[PDB]
Amino acid sequence: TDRVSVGNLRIARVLYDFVNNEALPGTDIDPDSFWAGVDKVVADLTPQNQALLNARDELQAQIDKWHRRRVIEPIDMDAYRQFLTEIGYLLPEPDDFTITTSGVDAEITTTAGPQLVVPVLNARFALNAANARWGSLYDALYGTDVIPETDGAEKGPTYNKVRGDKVIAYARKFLDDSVPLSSGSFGDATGFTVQDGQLVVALPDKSTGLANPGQFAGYTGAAESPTSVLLINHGLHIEILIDPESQVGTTDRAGVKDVILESAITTIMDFEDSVAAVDAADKVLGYRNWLGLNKGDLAARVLNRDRNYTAPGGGQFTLPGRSLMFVRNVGHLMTNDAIVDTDGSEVFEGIMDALFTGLIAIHGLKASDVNGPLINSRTGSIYIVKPKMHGPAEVAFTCELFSRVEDVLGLPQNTMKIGIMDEERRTTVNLKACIKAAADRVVFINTGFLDRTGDEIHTSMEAGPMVRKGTMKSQPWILAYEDHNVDAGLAAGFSGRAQVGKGMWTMTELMADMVETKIAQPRAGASTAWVPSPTAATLHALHYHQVDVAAVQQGLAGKRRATIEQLLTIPLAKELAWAPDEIREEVDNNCQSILGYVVRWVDQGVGASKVPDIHDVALMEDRATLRISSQLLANWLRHGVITSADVRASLERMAPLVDRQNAGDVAYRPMAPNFDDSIAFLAAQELILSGAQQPNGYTEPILHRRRREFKARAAE
Ligand SMILES: O=C([O-])c1ccc[nH]1
Ligand SMILES: [Mg+2]
Ligand SMILES: [Mg+2]
Ligand SMILES: [Mg+2]
């Protein structure tokens, strides 16, 4: 139609122009050979990609059949596990080894701290995350519920001094716990001066330096009365801003205006579950943003420059002002019409992503203006997160794909590093082998709730009814999965070399609860964890100051805290474990999760936002929320727990609920009462009723189709 012919490919014009006009210039890759490479790589790797997807299907069918031919008391783990080994699901574990990945930035190998994930299609959000390397601690405490809004300390229309003073005292205590004075407390500090390269803090009666003088990293302005003071603890920077003339400064004993924390050390720019991209137009929007980020020129309003400091011993240095960027590609499943072949077949979206996000990322290894000076990776690496892989063969393929892209791009081999997401059972039980498959490219493994539970449900769909969604969070299989992931990471030498990450805090407004509970993640040996906002990044940073992750990691070394049996413990529900009203609540719960998420996705192409749940708690979940919820319902429908009338009834009374939760949104169009007119509603209905049939429970085939449907209707 409006496509460009390159060998066997018919490339969508919008994509072809974008690449020639925006992505290629400055890379010194010849446009003609770039496209011949796209054509070659797509032709060479497409059959293996598809072979892998059929492998998934062959394995699931065998497992479905195993449960079906069985009666059978509870499952015999010797039998189950022997079966899994026979069919090639459970592969033998390789001998110990250390990963050999190199050329990796210090933000990933060394520094422990928060990690942001943001929809790359949203330019404002993406710029915010990139700028979230540094955040105001005062703003974070004042603005959220960490400082509780009791009587007197309420956020008003204007400054509340009672609340402000609380904020100040919270931070002072943090200073004391993080960068202690030889004697006294920051709570009594009256001033700061840099004297003989040391930091000197003035107390009402005396003066003192730091217990560990070396925690002093620098300052701004004159040593004799600095405008700010730079500290360091556990690899992370803390900056005390000093200005008596500022609105908070006047109130402060030492003229302190704010405390700034190094927060989001790295950010993942996401093309997968947090965005809605169903065609060439949507992909180009994403690719364009990814390009602006890497060239430094994205504006929505710009990217921050690095920060200037004076060394304690007089010199004059810089710190990065931007979060170091990963990109998350889509996984192996989906195709996309941005390129079709002569036959009209869509091309695998994962393959395209490597080619185009890899091409684009070259700009980030280069001076940004194009004069200067920002850059992403200074060590010369491109950092790609790859989600939803199943097993070491799927990881090997991603490496081979990267190898071939690097060739087309003229990059050295292994420039393209992989972040291995551990969110599918066949990866979890073969984790060590997956890490070995990428032993020279891997910079990251991580765990999460949503996708991994959905796969857990879909895999054992035929075994019986599963426990509630809430129950899933604390089942034996997931707790083993969490620990087993750290163990594999630490045993492959990730400490000092690569990130070991944990899941997203989805409750954007529940910051007090986050600060209280998310500390478990670094205590479990995770050198990074996912946060929903720059504000959450700043608050989660506190955890890394309280917890010596490096030491925690050294302590876990050599431990084996999860057995294959634990990992293989299917979350089946006990002999009829729910009262009727409990069943209804769970059904409502899941139907609302789907409706609330689906409606924004199908109608508006939003893949991530603050979606009020059934109790009006704001959650920022990604598409994986659709996978658990619909799989759970599909499972319950499959095993007689609920009826199809139950599902339709729930959908019909949760729908208008969702409507009014989206009241105050001008573009929003309600689903109720003409349900079978809403494409969103029908998408929700299809996810559930077709759920047991989606490959590995994946929701994109259905979601993408319905979103495309909607876009077509809107085009009249
Ligand atoms: O909850 C999550 O996994 C998530 C990632 C990005 C936005 N939400
Ligand atoms: Mg996921
Ligand atoms: Mg310590
Ligand atoms: Mg199936």
* Same domain membership, residue 418 and residue 291: yes
Give the CA dihedral 331, 336, 338, 344, nearest 10 degrees.
130
58 Cβ neighbours under 8 A, 6+ residues apart: none
* Same domain membership, residue 549 and residue 667: no
Among 197, 229, 262, the domain-final residue is 262
Using an 8 Å Cβ cutoff, are 188 and 204 in contact?
Answer: yes
Using an 8 Å Cβ cutoff, are 80 and 230 in contact?
Answer: no
* Same domain membership, residue 569 and residue 580: no
Would you give the DSSP letter of residue 376? Answer: S
**Span from the CA of 713 to the centroid of ligand 4 (angstroms):** 30
**Span from the CA of 450 to the centroid of ligand 2 (angstroms):** 6
Identify the burial level of 479 via C-beta atoms within 10 angstroms of its C-beta, where 0-12 means exposed, 13-18 middle and 19 or more buried: middle
Using an 8 Å Cβ cutoff, are 465 and 636 in contact?
Answer: yes
- Ligand 1: which residue has its CA nearest to atom 5? 622
Cis peptide before 666 (omega within 30 of 0): no
Amino acid symbol at 193? T
Q: Which residues pair with 383 in a beta bridge?
A: 417
Identify the burial level of 167 via C-beta atoms within 10 angstroms of its C-beta, where 0-12 means exposed, 13-18 middle and 19 or more buried: buried
| 3-state SS track over 476-540 | HHHHHHHHHHHHHHHHCCCCCCCEEEEEECCCCCCHHHHHHHCCHHHHCCCCEEEECCHHHHHHH
Q: Which residues pair with 466 in a beta bridge?
A: 572
Give the distance, in angstroms, between the CA of residue 570 and the centroid of all CA atoms in the same chain: 26
| 3-state SS track over 386-420 | ECCCCCHHHHHHHHHHHHHHHHHHCCCCCCEEEEE
Residues preceding gaps in the chain (C to N > 2.5 Å): 300
Enter the tokens of residue 477.
């299989």
Backbone angles phi, psi at 280, to 5 degrees: -60, -40
Location of structure tokens 């009723």: 689
Cα distance between residue 279 and residue 704, in whole Å: 9
Location of structure tokens 């720019």: 269
Cα distance between residue 714 and residue 716, in whole Å: 6
> What is the 3-state composition of the chain as percent helix, strand, coil, each rounded to the nearest 5?
45, 15, 40
355 Cβ neighbours under 8 A, 6+ residues apart: 37, 38, 41, 405, 408
Within 13 Å of residue 501, how many CA atoms lie on the same side as its CB?
Answer: 34
Under DSSP, is residue 383 helix (H, G, I), strand (E, B) or coil?
A: strand
**Span from the CA of 60 to the centroid of ligand 4 (angstroms):** 7
Best residue among 274, 514, 611, 619 to mutate for probing ligand 1's pocket (most ligand atoms within 8 Å of CB) is 274
Cα distance between residue 54 and residue 690, in whole Å: 19
Under DSSP, is residue 270 helix (H, G, I), strand (E, B) or coil?
A: strand
Under DSSP, is residue 71 helix (H, G, I), strand (E, B) or coil?
A: coil
Cα distance between residue 50 and residue 425, in whole Å: 20
Ligand number nearest CA of 701 is: 4
Using an 8 Å Cβ cutoff, are 192 and 254 in contact?
Answer: yes
476-491 helix and 450-459 helix, angle to the nearest 10 degrees: 120
Q: Which atom, in ligand 1's list, is nearest to the CA of 117? A: 6
Using an 8 Å Cβ cutoff, are 56 and 696 in contact?
Answer: yes
* Same domain membership, residue 447 and residue 553: yes
Cα distance between residue 542 and residue 527, in whole Å: 13
624-639 helix and 679-689 helix, angle to the nearest 10 degrees: 50
Cα distance between residue 494 and residue 478, in whole Å: 21
Give me the DSSP letters along 193-255. Answer: EEETTEEEEE-SS-EE-BSSGGGEEEEES-TTS-SEEEEEETTEEEEEEE-TTSTTTTTSTT-
Q: Which residues are catalytic?
A: 328, 622
Q: Which residues pair with 233 in a beta bridge?
A: 236
Under DSSP, is residue 326 helix (H, G, I), strand (E, B) or coil?
A: strand
Cα distance between residue 497 and residue 52, in whole Å: 30
Using an 8 Å Cβ cutoff, are 382 and 416 in contact?
Answer: yes
Amino acid symbol at 191? G
694 Cβ neighbours under 8 A, 6+ residues apart: 458, 687, 701, 702
Question: What separation in angstroms does the CA of 293 have from each of 157, 283, 382, 604?
Answer: 35, 15, 13, 24
- Around ion ligand 2, residues with a beta carbon closer than 5 Å are 423, 451, 624
Would you give the DSSP letter of residue 574? Answer: P
Cα distance between residue 540 and residue 121, in whole Å: 25
Cα distance between residue 387 and residue 334, in whole Å: 12
Q: What is the CA radius of gyration of the chain?
A: 26
Cα distance between residue 205 and residue 190, in whole Å: 10
* Same domain membership, residue 126 and residue 185: no
**Span from the CA of 431 to the centroid of ligand 1 (angstroms):** 22
Q: Which residues pair with 317 in a beta bridge?
A: 309
Experimental method: X-ray
Tally DSSP H helices, then E strands, for the chain: 25, 24
Identify the burial level of 520 via C-beta atoms within 10 angstroms of its C-beta, where 0-12 means exposed, 13-18 middle and 19 or more buried: middle
Backbone angles phi, psi at 337, to 5 degrees: -80, 10
Using an 8 Å Cβ cutoff, are 249 and 256 in contact?
Answer: yes
The CATH number for 633's domain is: 1.20.1220.12
Using a 6 Å CB cutoff, which residues line ligand 1? 117, 274, 448, 450, 504, 506, 608, 620-622
CA triplet 61, 63, 67: central angle to 5 degrees?
A: 120
Among 229, 246, 262, the domain-final residue is 262
Cα distance between residue 54 and residue 48, in whole Å: 10
173 Cβ neighbours under 8 A, 6+ residues apart: 187
Best residue among 118, 273, 469 to mutate for probing ligand 1's pocket (most ligand atoms within 8 Å of CB) is 273
Cα distance between residue 310 and residue 216, in whole Å: 11
Q: Which residues pair with 116 in a beta bridge?
A: 267, 531
* Same domain membership, residue 487 and residue 607: no
Amino acid symbol at 268? I
Give the distance, in angstroms, between the CA of residue 502 and the centroid of all CA atoms in the same chain: 9
In terms of residue numbers, what domain contains 258? 134-262
Total number of domains constituting the chain: 3
**Span from the CA of 97 to the centroid of ligand 3 (angstroms):** 29
679-689 helix and 580-604 helix, angle to the nearest 10 degrees: 130
Which of 34, 22, 30 lies closest to 287 in space, CA to CA?
Answer: 22
The CATH number for 400's domain is: 3.20.20.360
* Same domain membership, residue 581 and residue 559: no
Q: Which atom, in ligand 1's list, is nearest to the CA of 622? A: 8
* Same domain membership, residue 684 and residue 657: yes
- Strands across the sheet with 216-220, in order? 134-136, 256-262, 236-242, 228-233, 216-220, 307-310, 316-319
* Same domain membership, residue 334 and residue 200: no
* Same domain membership, residue 656 and residue 695: yes
Question: What separation in angstroms does the CA of 65 have from each of 1, 340, 457, 643?
Answer: 45, 36, 16, 24
Cα distance between residue 697 and residue 710, in whole Å: 23
Among 533, 550, 573, the domain-final residue is 573
Cα distance between residue 34 and residue 11, in whole Å: 13
The H or E element spanning position 313 is none
Question: What separation in angstroms does the CA of 683 have from each of 287, 514, 598, 709?
Answer: 27, 33, 7, 10
* Same domain membership, residue 452 and residue 415: yes
CA triplet 702, 419, 323: central angle to 5 degrees?
A: 100
Under DSSP, is residue 42 helix (H, G, I), strand (E, B) or coil?
A: helix
* Same domain membership, residue 327 and residue 415: yes
To one decimal, the resolution in angstroms is 2.5
Would you give the DSSP letter of residue 407? Answer: H
Best residue among 272, 451, 617, 620 to mutate for probing ligand 1's pocket (most ligand atoms within 8 Å of CB) is 620
